[PDB]
Design a protein around this ligand. Structure first.
Ligand code: NI
Length: 186
């Protein structure tokens, strides 16, 4: 059968992380959260909340700057610092890294791999950052989702929180199983 990975970038966020997690848990569905280190270290209890509910945490860098032009040692500092915040909060080491803006080069791939991280982007983008209506977010996801889809969404967004129940309902009716990015890639 068909699998899809729902993903949320840029958290955690007071109020919203807990709300996203509760919706997923209420629907028997798991997702992948790509957290910014500066946010993660302010809110360790929210990291534990993501993982206690069966969700995966990935890195989204410490600072959330475009990493395209960083020196190798700064790429290391950005990833290693975030990996350490996450494992100190959850006891679970992340294995995935989504670069800010999806910007990368071969060196960032090599540094990520040397830290035991896979670089992941996405293949379905309903542009939920520059807030669309909840109906147009739903329709972009349901019109583009295929077996192996990795859906880019953003934490801390009421319009995204609003769209989740309809996305989960309709994809479940189309026979999709919801998996983590790690499970999807195997
Ligand atoms: Ni981001």
């Amino acid at each position: 059968g068909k699998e899809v990975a729902l993903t949320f970038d840029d958290g955690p966020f007071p109020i919203y992380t807990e709300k996203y997690v509760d919706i997923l848990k209420s629907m028997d569905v798991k997702a992948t959260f790509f957290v910014i280190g500066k946010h993660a270290e302010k809110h360790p209890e929210l990291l534990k909340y993501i993982v206690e509910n069966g969700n995966e945490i990935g890195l989204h860098s410490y600072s959330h700057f475009n990493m395209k032009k960083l020196k190798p040692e700064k790429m290391v500092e950005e990833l290693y610092k975030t990996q350490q915040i996450i494992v100190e909060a959850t006891g679970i080491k992340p294995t995935l890294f989504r670069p800010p803006f999806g910007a990368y080069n071969s060196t960032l791939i090599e540094i990520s791999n040397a830290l035991g991280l896979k670089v992941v982007l996405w293949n379905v983008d309903p542009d939920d950052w520059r807030n669309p209506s909840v109906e147009s977010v739903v329709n972009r996801v349901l019109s583009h989702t295929r077996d192996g889809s990795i859906i880019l969404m953003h934490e801390g967004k009421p319009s995204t929180l609003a769209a989740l129940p309809q996305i989960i309902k309709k994809l479940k009716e189309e026979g999709y199983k919801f998996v983590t990015v790690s499970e999807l890639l195997e």
